[PDB]
């Protein structure tokens, strides 16, 4: 897991799946790492979540075309909070196409956050350059709009915060969760991607399969410890 800034830190799954944790200060929480993922194909690149802000953004996005040689063209966020498009702005300066779930879109334009261009209400399946990108919203979790980015050709599934990692003990941030669906959401996303070979989180190391069954305790943990 090589280093590429003092902030940012990139690991390579596949030929032409990356992932990368970027560290950033977040009142109340602290030093605190987020992930997202680059998919390169023909010199292309989509990026799955930014950084926080626009300059990890920009550092990000130079560093694709230099180390991999590829153009940044589209950009699909998890949800609205600030470790998925918080350096859109950025981006957009550069004209990148952005897709999202429709909730997304209406959460960011209300709330005075730059605005991504194409929703989906349920399923989006976009080309970078004839490599199929596949999202789905299977019902709210972390996050109302939240949804997941799944990878046919690479079996690789990008659960982003609706999924933790398996050294988390804690339910985390649900200030915008919602835990009434949670765990029918999760039970979908085990049912749809029974053979995925990669799931990567949107905060810890990544796994397989098993994220999805250590999440769904985590929740049910909750649902019971406070009810
Ligand atoms: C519990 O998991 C992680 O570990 C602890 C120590 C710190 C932490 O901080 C977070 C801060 C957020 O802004 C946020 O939105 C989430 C969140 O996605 O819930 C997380 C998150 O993931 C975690
Ligand atoms: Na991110
Ligand atoms: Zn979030
Ligand atoms: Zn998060």
């Not at 390579?12 to 109340?28: C, F, R």
């Not at 030093?31 to 023909?42: A, H």
């Not at 109302?144 to 050709?153: E, G, K, M, Q, S």
């Not at 969760?177 to 949670?182: F, H, I, L």
């Amino acid at each position: 897991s090589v280093k590429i800034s003092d902030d940012i830190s990139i690991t390579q799954l596949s030929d032409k799946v990356y992932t990368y944790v970027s560290l950033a200060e977040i009142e109340g929480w602290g030093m605190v790492p987020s992930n997202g993922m680059i998919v390169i194909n023909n010199h292309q690149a989509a990026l799955l979540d930014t950084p926080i802000n626009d300059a990890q953004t920009e550092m990000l996005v130079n560093w694709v075309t230099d180390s991999l040689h590829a153009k940044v063209t589209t950009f699909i966020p998890n949800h609205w909070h600030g470790d998925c498009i918080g350096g859109l702005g950025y981006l957009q300066r550069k004209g990148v196409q952005s897709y999202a779930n429709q909730m997304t879109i209406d959460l960011a334009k209300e709330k005075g956050l730059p605005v991504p261009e194409h929703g989906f209400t349920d399923s989006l399946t976009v080309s970078l350059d004839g490599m199929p990108l596949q999202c789905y919203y299977l019902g709210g979790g972390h996050a109302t709009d939240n949804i997941v980015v799944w990878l046919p050709t690479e079996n690789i599934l990008f659960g982003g915060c609706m999924l933790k990692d398996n050294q988390a003990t804690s339910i985390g941030n649900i200030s915008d969760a919602d835990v009434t669906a949670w765990p029918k959401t999760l039970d979908k996303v085990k049912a749809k991607f029974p053979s995925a070979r990669y799931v990567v989180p949107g905060h810890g190391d990544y796994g397989g399969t098993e994220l999805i069954e250590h999440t769904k305790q985590i929740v049910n943990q909750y649902i019971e410890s406070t009810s």
